[PDB]
Amino acid sequence: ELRVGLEESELWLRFKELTNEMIVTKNGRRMFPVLKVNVSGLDPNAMYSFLLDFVAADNHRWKYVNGEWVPGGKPEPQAPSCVYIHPDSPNFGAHWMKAPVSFSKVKLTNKLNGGGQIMLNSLHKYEPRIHIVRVGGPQRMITSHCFPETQFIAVTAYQNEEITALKIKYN
Ligand SMILES: CN1CCN(C(=O)Nc2ccccc2)CC1
């Protein structure tokens, strides 16, 4: 059985208990914490691409009102985010299993852009999700996995100073 684990869940959970926030910029901002995934049970000899996307966790716009995040009352459907390909892709199972797969190079933006960067809607809540895609073989296969511990709200600047403090303390 293919196993997918979050690395450093300890720390992600401290961010989640405060409501996590991730900065988006026109040019694209790298994430902290970085999503790092432990994977076992791949065929060491099979070929795989690791993909990262962001599900809109709800259909609402969120606002930081008197020190607390609160959803709006006017939900709109949220079209899916674009996919980020891990730059080690495509690669052997052995490659992916020798150390945590670290998405250190994904950039989050609020503006449609050349590419690389992934465009999110500011003040929406997102749940990171990976796809593990077996490629090159006869049988294509996809395994997907969400990471609720890594949920955040996309912001153009931090609202909760307790997040600001944690971001610096641990970087
Ligand atoms: C620079 N990039 C990195 C490697 N890459 C892919 O892995 N694409 C792909 C193709 C089919 C299924 C999943 C991913 C495209 C080029």
Which CATH number does the domain housing residue 171 bear? Answer: 2.60.40.820
Q: How far apart are CA 12 and CA 149, in angstroms?
A: 6
Looking at the 3D structure of the chain, how many domains does it have?
1
Ligand 1 neighbourhood includes 130 CB (under 6 angstroms): no
Distance (Å, rounded) from C-alpha 12 to C-alpha 34? 9
- Rounded CA-CA distance 112/57 in Å is 21
Give the Å distances, CA to CA, from 118 to 54, 90, 131. Answer: 9, 20, 16
> How far is the centre of ligand 1, averaged over its atoms, from the C-alpha of 92 (Å)?
13
C-beta of residue 39 within 8 angstroms of C-beta of residue 4: yes
Ligand 1 center to 147 CA (angstroms): 22
3-state secondary structure of 124: coil
- Are the C-beta atoms of 141 and 131 separated by less than 8 Å? no
Is residue 141 lining ligand 1, measured as CB closer than 6 Å?
no
Ligand 1 pocket member 133 (CB < 6 A): yes
Q: Which residue from 146, 32, 45, 25 is spatially nearest to 96, judged by alpha carbons?
A: 45
Q: What's the token pair of residue 35?
A: 């999503």
Cα-to-centroid distance, 87 and ligand 1 (Å): 8
The CA angle 117-121-125, to the nearest 5 degrees, is 110
**Cis-peptide, bond into residue 71, ω within 30° of zero:** no
Domain range for 169 is: 1-171
* Distance of alpha carbon 3 from alpha carbon 37, whole angstroms: 10
